[PDB]
C-alpha cells in the first residue's frame, strides 16, 4: 500500500557521520514534505528538520544546524538524513514522516532507524546462569534465568529451550552500564517441580558480533 | 516555547474515561495533533488539526481546544490502548503521556541470585534481584551488604506492562569485582511495595 521505508541500524563512533534512507512507496514522494523526528531511548520525540523533496529546500532545527544535511533522489523517492561529528548522545531512533498537509499531521511514519553512537567497539555478550535455588522458589514457582552481560550494541535476541519455552519469560530492556557497554537479564518463572524433571537453557544471540551462546542452567547445588 | 502535557503519566481501569492536556508556553496555532506511540513502534497519527479523528481510528479516540489549551479524550479505555500519547504543534512536541491499565494490586514475589562461579572467575560479580509480577508501578529496591546501604553500585530495568495480566516486572542488578565481593558476607535487596504489608528483604551469606 503506502509506506515509508528505512534504511538498518547503526553503530557509530563520536566525529563518525550516519546516513539514514527513507523510501516513499504508493504515493507521489514530491507531493509532501519529508520530516525527521528522532527518539533517545526512554525518551520523547524531538523533530529534526524537514526536506521539500521537489525544490530540495531543507529547514533544520538550530540544534542540528551545521551537522544535519537532508537530501534527495527523486528518481528512486528517497529522502536521506545524514548527521555528521556525531555526539553519543544523538543515539536515538531516527523516523522519516510525511507531512500530509499545512497541519503538520505525521500521517506517516517510517519504523525507525536505530542509531548508536559510542566510543565502545563491538562486543559480545558473556552469559551467566541465574540459578534457581532457595532464594528464588515460592509459592510452588520458581525462577530462572540468564545474565546477558557487557556487550555493545543492541540488540540481543534470548531464547529458552529453542524457543519451546514461552509462557513466564520476561526478558528485560538492557541497562548501558557505566563502561558504555549493555546487561540485560531474561528470567523465565516455572513450577518449581520442574526444577528436577527439566532442563533449562537459554539460548542468547547477538548478532552485531556474530556471537551465539546456549547455556545451561543449572540449579544450585 | 514549550510544550507541557498534564499529567505525565496516569493509570485508569479499562471503561474509565481518560483526559490528557496540552498546553502551549504561547500561543502557536489553532492546529494541533495528537499521537499514539506503543511500545517498540513507530508513532501514529490519531488526531489532526485539533479535533478531527484521523480516519480507521476507533471513535472513542477524540481531542478537543484552541489558542494555548487542548485537550484529548479516549471515551472509554481499552487495553490495547497502553501507550505514550504526544501533542505537537509543528517543531513542537509535547514531552509525552504514559498510560497504563489500572488493576488490582498485586505484590510482587520477591527473588535473589548469587553470582555464577563462572563469572567470579572472570573477576565480577553481579548479584541479581527479581520482582516479579506486581502491580502498580511503584517499586523501591534497594542492595545491603552487611546491611550497609549501597549507592552508585546498581542499575534497575522494568518491563513494559504485561498484555495478558496488568504486570510489571523489575531485575535489579548489583555489580562488584569480586575481590570487593569477598570483604562482605550478607547480600541483601530490601523491596518495597504498596502490595506489602512491610519491606520484604531478601538476602543470602556469600558461601
Known amino acids: 500500500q503506502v509506506q515509508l521505508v528505512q534504511s538498518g541500524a547503526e553503530v557509530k563512533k563520536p566525529g563518525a557521520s550516519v546516513k539514514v534512507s527513507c523510501k516513499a512507496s504508493?504515493?507521489?514522494?514530491?507531493?509532501?514534505?519529508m520530516h525527521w523526528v528522532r527518539q533517545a531511548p526512554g525518551q520523547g520525540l524531538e523533530w529534526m528538520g524537514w526536506?521539500?523533496?521537489?525544490?530540495?529546500?531543507?529547514n533544520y532545527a538550530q540544534k542540528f544546524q551545521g551537522r544535519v544535511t537532508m537530501t534527495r533522489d527523486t528518481s528512486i523517492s528517497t529522502a536521506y538524513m545524514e548527521l555528521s561529528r556525531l555526539r553519543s548522545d544523538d543515539t536515538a531512533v531516527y523516523y522519516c514522516?510525511?507531512?500530509?498537509?499545512?497541519?503538520?499531521?505525521?500521517?506517516?511514519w517510517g519504523r525507525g532507524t536505530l542509531v548508536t553512537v559510542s566510543s565502545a567497539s563491538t562486543k559480545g555478550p558473556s552469559v551467566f546462569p541465574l540459578a534457581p535455588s532457595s532464594k528464588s522458589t515460592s509459592g510452588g514457582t520458581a525462577a530462572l534465568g540468564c545474565l546477558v552481560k557487557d556487550y555493545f550494541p543492541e540488540p540481543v535476541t534470548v531464547s529458552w529451550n529453542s524457543g519451546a519455552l514461552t509462557s513466564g519469560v520476561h526478558t528485560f530492556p538492557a541497562v548501558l552500564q557505566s563502561s558504555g557497554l549493555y546487561s540485560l537479564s531474561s528470567v523465565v518463572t516455572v513450577p518449581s517441580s520442574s526444577l528436577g524433571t527439566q532442563t533449562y537453557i537459554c539460548n542468547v544471540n547477538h548478532k552485531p558480533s556474530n556471537t551465539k551462546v546456549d547455556k545451561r542452567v543449572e540449579p544450585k547445588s | 516555547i514549550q510544550m507541557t502535557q498534564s499529567p505525565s503519566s496516569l493509570s485508569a481501569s479499562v471503561g474509565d474515561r481518560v483526559t490528557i492536556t496540552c498546553q502551549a508556553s504561547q500561543d502557536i496555532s489553532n492546529y494541533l495533533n495528537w499521537y499514539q506511540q506503543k511500545p517498540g513502534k513507530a508513532p501514529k497519527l490519531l488526531i489532526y488539526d485539533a479535533s478531527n479523528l484521523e480516519t480507521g481510528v476507533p471513535s472513542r479516540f477524540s481531542g478537543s481546544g484552541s489558542g494555548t489549551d487542548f485537550t484529548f479524550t479516549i471515551s472509554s479505555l481499552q487495553p490495547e490502548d497502553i501507550a505514550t500519547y504526544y501533542c505537537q504543534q509543528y517543531e513542537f512536541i509535547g514531552p509525552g503521556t504514559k498510560v497504563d491499565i489500572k488493576r488490582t494490586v498485586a505484590a510482587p514475589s520477591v527473588f535473589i541470585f548469587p553470582p555464577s562461579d563462572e563469572q567470579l572467575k572472570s573477576g565480577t560479580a553481579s548479584v541479581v534481584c527479581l520482582l516479579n509480577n506486581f502491580y502498580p508501578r511503584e517499586a523501591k529496591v534497594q542492595w545491603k551488604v552487611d546491611n550497609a546501604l549501597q549507592s552508585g553500585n546498581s542499575q534497575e530495568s522494568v518491563t513494559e506492562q504485561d498484555s495478558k495480566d496488568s504486570t510489571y516486572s523489575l531485575s535489579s542488578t548489583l555489580t562488584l569485582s569480586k575481590a570487593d565481593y569477598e570483604k562482605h558476607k550478607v547480600y541483601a535487596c530490601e523491596v518495597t511495595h504498596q502490595g506489602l504489608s512491610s519491606p520484604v528483604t531478601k538476602s543470602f551469606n556469600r558461601g
Open positions: 514522516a510525511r507531512e500530509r498537509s499545512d497541519f503538520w499531521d505525521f500521517d506517516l
Open positions: 504508493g504515493y507521489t514522494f514530491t507531493g509532501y514534505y
Open positions: 526536506i521539500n523533496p521537489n525544490s530540495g529546500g531543507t
